[PDB]
Design a protein around this ligand. Structure first.
Ligand code: ADP
Lengths: 10, 473, 65, 445
């Protein structure tokens, strides 16, 4: 469960 | 509810507390819980008699939610109307419910069941020489039906177009109509000699649905709901092959019609000469006495503009008295005018096949008097764990909109923000990364996009093809 | 050497843009803009902007029944 | 956590008070059981010999493997001043407290006890019909008032005052209502033994000027007593203390003789399931529980829709989850409640899921998740939604004459940990309101 990861993007 | 002290937490449950009743000594065995107010049924799927109750509950009560452990059904007027038709009475239902219910059935529930379970089986709609006759085996029914404002062994004619009105009036009135077709004793309609070849196989749930449909031995009319890809084409082919009568299939596409016909021939022994496809390209019909006509709702519901060949086809369809109609994706029949085809087209039996029996508007309930009640439904997770269908790891990706586009999102009107939040760069970047990763994983990927402009932009950006309405066959 | 009492609001560009729109309609909301993630706002309007922002965001969230 | 909490409170007490606390064998018998097994072994070895043994001899008993346990045992024993270390003749001799020694000797050998354990009236009552019902009802009333469900017979002002003055059950007169907190939910999550110990400890801390030693005499003697028998009535403070303890559902009075109840024995030591529930992927909860306490606590984070005699059915919604979070309840605590009250069906299906996971890839031992990960993700995401907006109180510093001064002030703020944001290009920074005064003083200096 990847909730605490930084949001995806460039 | 007499001399029952409420609990301190009874206030939190507004007329929903069900502690006023006591539990039977055999609760450890009885798996059923019944709601005396909302009609919801809680089924224990991990206790004895769970299998014995899983089908009876499906028959008498519609499913609300069926997660892994605890199943949730619901009893409604339409569900009881569907159940009362197939040799089921309040006495038997109550006997089984009491034998399987941890709690006794309340008088309110008994009254609700009794009110609706005793108003069926007094009218039959028959067809003779392209004429619709509302035949009733009893005469005393006339003194009320003929005296009612709407209506008007004895048989009287009725307008074909007025079927959609008379059926709804029958739903409103005590007696609803049932469409039973005794194909065994039906000799006027020419027979079609097609049978399922040995290569055919029927899955256990398909066999169960067919048993629920043909238990009494007389073919009824109604709707079948199976998950997409469950084998609805094979179900329809089996129904046609066992009925052995002239049949017309309505499908909402041309590629769908092509594969419909291809599977039809592959699965059964239908001779090519007896098969006809009615589409925009070719409109020829079988010259044999009996055959199948596979067309689309667009080709059956249009009344203003018709070609010369299509006009001859429509005249053929209207003149001949069909024996069976198969409606693929029936959720569109209650539309403004698609419902007109049910009344205009003449047929002794109507079957609908659809993976979903819901639609945005309230016309979904009109299906009851348009084509009949629902017959069978199948769970998804059950088949997934039994290996009949695949398992899916459904995921929702949250793509944060960048500030440059969000600032315009704030000011832009409703119509423009739709394209704005659909064409954000983060989605493009995520799509590219996922495409590369899954291509390295060797997966076959489909990318859906309703918006044609967005589809074209993505396709031109990624060098991959796009398909939409303008694409030729 | 000058001190100014106020409330520091730390957020992301999207929330900052929403706050900018709210301030543009009501200048008194944001006392000053510190950076693309920080805004100085009036202490009295904090309790009101929190509730009003919740109301505004309720539209983007689908709450059945 | 039971023994740890009791030991921590007993450790915080002064040595002068502990020496007087060890006077009665009843208190000693209760304190002795709380120590670690190695400490208990050493205490039993030392009690029966009237001599001094060097610490090295005690060290010899412990094997190399339990050398770590030896350190914890000796540290815990020395913290309570139970063992008095006397150094003479170049050896660190170890001796036991004389009062503790004499109390243990009297208790074990049936010596003079001064009726510390009380007497017997030989007039027994029906425990199941009266004691059990009385204590169950009273504990249910207090827990119901804690969870906030309406209840007719509200608890007495004594326990209500204790609740308010403690961190438990935060209350405000301006709001005019009482609400549960994070510690309240943790208290409700704790077992019956710890639930009683928490309230008793809060009472112990609350009481001022009733002797501290006397309160422990009464509590430990109550733990000593056995349910289902009479006990004639004691200290003057202990009389009013007994009346107060009657308000917690521990001791029953006719209206001359007091009777301990099941909770009295529960205080000393410990001792399908009710409370087990099923959570579906549709955010539905079906708890096979028949108890107003469980129903009320479930209502904190469940939007209840109906109930039956055998079970309670509800639906998880953003409103209920936000209510629970606003009360200060953590998603970790919620999932802990659900996990420890998971149904056997859910546990078996999760065990099969873990077995399938390990069979597919036994190299990695994945964690055992009883309930679907989607519910956990949704709850944590709602917590993140509540935490989306972040605000601080303070002041902004700008218009710095020199970059050196700007850097000096910002670096000082960072060193004292009151810096929240800075920008060198603009020569600006923000500091917390707490550190505003310190930063201003440093700027002046
Ligand atoms: N009993 C069955 N035996 C073999 N294949 C089956 C069976 N039931 C379904 N299928 C397969 O499932 C797929 C989908 O069938 P189709 O009739 O197109 O489903 P639907 O119309 O419900 O989407 C086809 O590949 C079909 O051969």
């Amino acid at each position: 469960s990847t909730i605490g990861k930084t949001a995806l993007g460039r | 509810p007499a001399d029952f002290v409420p609990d301190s937490v009874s206030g939190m449950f507004r007329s929903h507390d069900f502690s006023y009743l006591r539990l039977r000594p055999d609760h450890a065995s009885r798996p059923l819980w019944i709601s005396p107010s909302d009609g919801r049924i809680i089924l224990e799927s991990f206790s004895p008699l769970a299998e014995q109750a899983q089908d009876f509950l499906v028959t008498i009560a519609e499913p609300i939610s069926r997660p892994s452990h605890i199943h949730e059904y619901k009893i409604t007027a339409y569900s009881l109307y569907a159940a009362v038709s197939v040799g089921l009475e309040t006495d038997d239902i109550i006997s089984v419910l009491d034998r399987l219910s941890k709690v006794p059935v309340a008088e309110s529930i008994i009254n609700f069941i009794k009110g609706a379970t005793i108003s069926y089986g007094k009218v039959k709609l028959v067809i003779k020489h392209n004429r619709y006759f509302v035949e009733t085996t009893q005469a005393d029914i006339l003194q009320m039906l003929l005296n009612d404002s709407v209506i008007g062994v004895h048989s009287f004619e009725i307008a074909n177009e007025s079927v959609e009105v008379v059926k709804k009036r029958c739903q409103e009135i005590d007696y609803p109509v049932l469409e039973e077709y005794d194909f065994r004793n039906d000799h006027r309609n020419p027979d079609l000699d097609i049978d399922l070849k040995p290569s055919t196989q029927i899955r256990p749930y398909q066999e169960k649905s067919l048993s629920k449909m043909f238990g009494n031995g007389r073919a009824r009319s109604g709707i079948i709901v199976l998950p997409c890809g469950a084998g609805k084409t094979l179900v329809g082919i089996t129904a046609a092959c066992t009925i052995k009568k002239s049949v017309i299939v309505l499908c909402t596409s041309s590629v769908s019609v092509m594969q419909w016909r291809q599977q039809f021939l592959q699965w059964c022994t239908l001779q090519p000469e007896n098969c006809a496809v009615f589409t925009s390209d070719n409109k020829e019909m079988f010259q044999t006495e009996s055959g199948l006509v596979v067309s689309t709702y667009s080709m059956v519901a249009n009344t203003r503009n018709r070609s010369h060949d299509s006009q001859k086809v429509m005249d053929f369809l209207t003149g001949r008295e069909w024996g069976f109609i198969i409606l693929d994706e029936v959720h569109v029949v209650p539309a403004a005018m698609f419902r007109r085809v049910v009344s205009t087209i003449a047929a002794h039996a109507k079957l609908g096949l659809t993976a979903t029996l819901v639609r945005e508007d309230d016309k979904i309930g009109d299906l009851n008097f348009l084509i009949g009640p629902k017959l069978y439904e199948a769970n998804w997770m059950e088949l997934s764990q039994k290996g009949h269908i695949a398992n899916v790891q459904c995921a929702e990706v949250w793509c944060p909109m960048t500030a440059e586009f969000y600032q315009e999102y704030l000011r832009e009107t409703a119509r423009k923000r739709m394209l704005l939040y659909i064409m954000n760069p983060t989605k493009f970047q995520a799509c590219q990364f996922l495409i590369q990763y899954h291509e390295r994983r060797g997966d076959k990927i489909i990318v859906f996009s309703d918006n044609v402009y967005a589809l074209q932009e993505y396709a031109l950006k990624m060098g991959k093809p796009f398909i939409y309405g303008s694409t030729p066959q | 050497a000058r001190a100014r009492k106020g409330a520091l609001v730390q957020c992301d560009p999207s929330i900052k843009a929403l706050i900018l729109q709210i301030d543009a309609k009501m200048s008194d909301i944001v006392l000053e803009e510190l950076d693309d993630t920080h805004l100085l706002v009036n202490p009295s309007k904090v309790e009101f902007v929190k509730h009003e922002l919740n109301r505004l965001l309720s539209k983007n969230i689908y709450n059945p029944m | 956590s039971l023994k740890h909490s009791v030991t921590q409170y007993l450790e915080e007490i002064p040595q002068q008070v502990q020496n007087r606390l060890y006077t009665s064998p009843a208190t000693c018998l209760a304190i002795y059981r709380i120590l670690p097994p190695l400490a208990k072994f050493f205490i039993m070895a030392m009690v029966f010999n009237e001599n001094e043994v060097p610490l090295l001899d005690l060290d010899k008993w412990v094997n190399s493997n339990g050398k770590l346990q030896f350190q914890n045992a000796i540290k815990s024993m020395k913290s309570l001043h139970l063992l008095i270390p006397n150094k003479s003749s170049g050896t660190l001799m170890i001796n036991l407290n004389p009062t503790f020694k004499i109390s243990l000797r009297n208790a074990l050998t049936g010596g003079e006890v001064q009726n510390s354990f009380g007497v017997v009236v030989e007039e027994n009552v029906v425990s199941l019909d009266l004691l059990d019902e009385y204590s169950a009802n009273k504990w249910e009333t207090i827990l119901h008032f804690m969870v906030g469900t309406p209840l007719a017979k509200i608890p007495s002002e004594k326990v209500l005052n204790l609740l308010k003055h403690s961190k438990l059950m935060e209350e405000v007169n301006s709001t005019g209502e009482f609400k549960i907190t994070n510690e309240g939910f943790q208290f409700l999550l704790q077992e019956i033994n710890s639930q009683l110990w928490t309230l008793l400890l809060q009472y112990l801390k609350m009481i001022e000027t009733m002797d501290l030693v006397d309160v422990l005499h009464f509590i430990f003697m109550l733990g000593a007593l056995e349910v289902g028998k009479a006990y004639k009535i004691l200290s003057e403070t202990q009389r009013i203390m007994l009346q107060d303890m009657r308000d917690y559902g521990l001791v029953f009075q006719k209206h001359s003789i007091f009777y301990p109840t099941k909770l009295a024995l529960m205080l000393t030591s410990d001792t399908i399931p009710d409370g087990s529930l099923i959570v579906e992927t549709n955010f539905k909860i079906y708890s096979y529980s028949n108890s107003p306490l469980q129903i009320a606590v479930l209502s904190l984070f469940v939007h209840l829709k109906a109930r039956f005699v055998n079970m309670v059915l509800g639906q998880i919604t953003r409103e209920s989850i936000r209510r629970a979070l606003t009360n200060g309840i953590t998603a970790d605590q919620i999932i802990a409640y659900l996990e420890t009250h998971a149904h056997p069906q859910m546990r078996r299906l999760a065990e099969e899921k873990l077995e399938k996971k390990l069979e597919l890839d036994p190299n990695c031992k994945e964690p055992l998740q009883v309930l679907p990960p989607t519910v956990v993700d949704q709850i944590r995401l709602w917590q993140l939604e509540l935490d989306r907006v972040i605000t601080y109180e303070g002041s902004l510093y700008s218009d710095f004459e020199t970059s050196q001064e700007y850097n000096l002030l910002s670096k000082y703020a960072q060193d004292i940990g009151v810096l929240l944001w800075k920008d060198d290009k603009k020569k600006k920074f923000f500091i917390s309101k707490e550190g505003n005064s310190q930063v201003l003083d440093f700027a002046k200096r």
